[PDB]
Design a protein around this ligand. Sequence first.
Ligand SMILES: CCOc1ccc(NC(=O)[C@H](/C=C/C2CC2)NC(=O)c2ccc(Nc3ccncc3)cc2)cn1
Ligand SMILES: CCOc1ccc(NC(=O)[C@H](/C=C/C2CC2)NC(=O)c2ccc(Nc3ccncc3)cc2)cn1
Ligand SMILES: Nc1ncnc2c1ncn2[C@@H]1O[C@H](C[C@@H](N)CC[C@H](N)C(=O)O)[C@@H](O)[C@H]1O
Ligand SMILES: Nc1ncnc2c1ncn2[C@@H]1O[C@H](C[C@@H](N)CC[C@H](N)C(=O)O)[C@@H](O)[C@H]1O
Ligand SMILES: [Zn+2]
Ligand SMILES: [Zn+2]
Ligand SMILES: [Zn+2]
Ligand SMILES: [Zn+2]
Ligand SMILES: [Zn+2]
Ligand SMILES: [Zn+2]
Ligand SMILES: [Zn+2]
Ligand SMILES: [Zn+2]
Lengths: 271, 261
Amino acid sequence: RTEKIICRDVARGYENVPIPCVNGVDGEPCPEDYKYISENCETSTMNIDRNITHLQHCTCVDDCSSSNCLCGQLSIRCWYDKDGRLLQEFNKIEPPLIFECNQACSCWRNCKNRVVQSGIKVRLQLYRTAKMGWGVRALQTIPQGTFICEYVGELISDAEADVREDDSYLFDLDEVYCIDARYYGNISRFINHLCDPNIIPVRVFMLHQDLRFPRIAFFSSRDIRTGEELGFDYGDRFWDIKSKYFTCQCGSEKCKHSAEAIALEQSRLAR
Amino acid sequence: TEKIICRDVARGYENVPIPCVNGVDGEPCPEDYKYISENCETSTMNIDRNITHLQHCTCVDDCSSSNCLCGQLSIRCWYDKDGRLLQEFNKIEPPLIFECNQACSCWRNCKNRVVQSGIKVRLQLYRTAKMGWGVRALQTIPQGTFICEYVGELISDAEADVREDDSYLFDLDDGEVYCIDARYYGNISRFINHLCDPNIIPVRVFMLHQDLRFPRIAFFSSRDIRTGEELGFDYGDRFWDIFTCQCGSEKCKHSAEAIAL
Ligand SMILES: CCOc1ccc(NC(=O)[C@H](/C=C/C2CC2)NC(=O)c2ccc(Nc3ccncc3)cc2)cn1
Ligand SMILES: CCOc1ccc(NC(=O)[C@H](/C=C/C2CC2)NC(=O)c2ccc(Nc3ccncc3)cc2)cn1
Ligand SMILES: Nc1ncnc2c1ncn2[C@@H]1O[C@H](C[C@@H](N)CC[C@H](N)C(=O)O)[C@@H](O)[C@H]1O
Ligand SMILES: Nc1ncnc2c1ncn2[C@@H]1O[C@H](C[C@@H](N)CC[C@H](N)C(=O)O)[C@@H](O)[C@H]1O
Ligand SMILES: [Zn+2]
Ligand SMILES: [Zn+2]
Ligand SMILES: [Zn+2]
Ligand SMILES: [Zn+2]
Ligand SMILES: [Zn+2]
Ligand SMILES: [Zn+2]
Ligand SMILES: [Zn+2]
Ligand SMILES: [Zn+2]
């Protein structure tokens, strides 16, 4: 079998870079049961607070590289190095919310605290995996801490998420709001679960500071090689709903959710 | 002597820098406002942003055919292949323009996305002889070219009635009345002066939402504009009824001399 480019850009020109799709595995055509969007959408009344006078903002007249930047101080510090990468010291167990600079700040649009709002810069590819359906892989080396993409979809309420039948694309922001990428989503809806993940989600605020709606940004948690599949840990809660339907195919020696890992735990509980 | 007093009054928010110069007097770069590249809110406007309420096209091409719903909503698509308004465009009573949006099936680079792609022409903020600050072209600009949007603070009818200074107040004009006030928050368009012989015209456009209470205001050149020419639109007789005009045209109808006659 031969690899087959089946779409030049699944984003239809909406991202900074094209995101091609290939399938060198089976006969599945390019996925089209969803609407690609590059930014979050709403399908009910949400009234995101966008009052420009409500925004916390900085007075910096440099590039916001100093510890005096207010937006960095709201994040405890700015966690971006000079190349726009997330610092290794960033705490994954208890991450602070990231507050990027915004339209109320006195700084320029190219200051050092605007990584996520500047969008996708790495070359990604939608591709057919051997055992998980569609997936996303890197077409380049990606250093640790690099911004990858945002989890984009339909903003819905807690109550609406209870009503939704399919939560295979439902991200819990943790009233409680979620992002459902089932019907509307970006490239992130195709990122699979890995028990040994190489990206992590981070909560970020940019052009609004409405605390019901953090945006979810994925950053690499280690150096990523060309061709390597991207994935994050969906979390035990997702698997406590979903392992009755399918089991994990990540194949890692550390896999916590495989058919066998579940059976081994069940046999320890019996013994 | 002409001094450059700002490399970019937009602070990097537009596609191009917009420098400011002064070769007339001692006035420094204007700083009594906040530059913003898109409209802002200072109170709850409840703009309908429901993606399922958008009318949108099913175009599998570049939206240059007559089956594009978004062009049909605008009577036709009025943009030529270069993104300029057609010569047949009603420059006196323009129709509403519906550009393609996030619900359309077309690509982001189809032919119906001129205003949402932002400023392309090179402009300069500069100190005029008699009108304070103004905006001029640093290049020739063909007729029908998109210049910039009138950007500011969205305010209600009642809020506009309470405001003291309407020198930056654009009336969006059935239904609830709203205004764009660029006094406190605005982009480069807040500096465009009135001309009785204008060379740009405002056009109402819809892009990412279709809440008909809140058209966005796009300025297009109404004729070929020469390099160095000051940009201006006709503020309208209502503004002048509710300083005297220094436009200098032989057709100026708001001058001190005109008002006295
Ligand atoms: C820095 C942040 O760290 C995080 C945060 C979140 C994650 N992981 C997830 O969010 C996970 C994502 C699954 C992939 C398909 C997208 N999805 C879920 O847990 C999930 C949970 C509950 C649920 N149901 C209801 C929820 C609310 N109200 C009512 C019902 C649906 C899905 C990882 N790291
Ligand atoms: C759509 C294309 O057609 C148009 C439309 C409008 C224009 N021209 C103007 O909009 C004009 C703009 C003046 C320049 C300084 C910005 N401004 C005004 O008429 C104006 C009117 C009333 C007012 N006051 C209140 C209003 C409501 N409620 C309370 C008070 C303030 C300003 C030209 N062509
Ligand atoms: N580690 C995994 N093992 C098996 N299936 C997975 C795994 N991670 C994701 N999936 C599958 O992908 C769904 C989640 C999607 N967000 C990911 C894109 C999906 N692979 C697709 O082809 O559309 C899950 O409901 C599973 O069907
Ligand atoms: N044709 C004109 N003649 C005299 N003054 C004008 C004319 N057009 C605009 N102005 C002045 O500019 C104001 C409108 C502003 N939106 C334009 C920018 C203004 N020139 C400034 O320096 O900030 C008016 O209140 C007038 O002060
Ligand atoms: Zn700062
Ligand atoms: Zn900044
Ligand atoms: Zn800031
Ligand atoms: Zn696993
Ligand atoms: Zn179309
Ligand atoms: Zn289109
Ligand atoms: Zn369209
Ligand atoms: Zn005049």
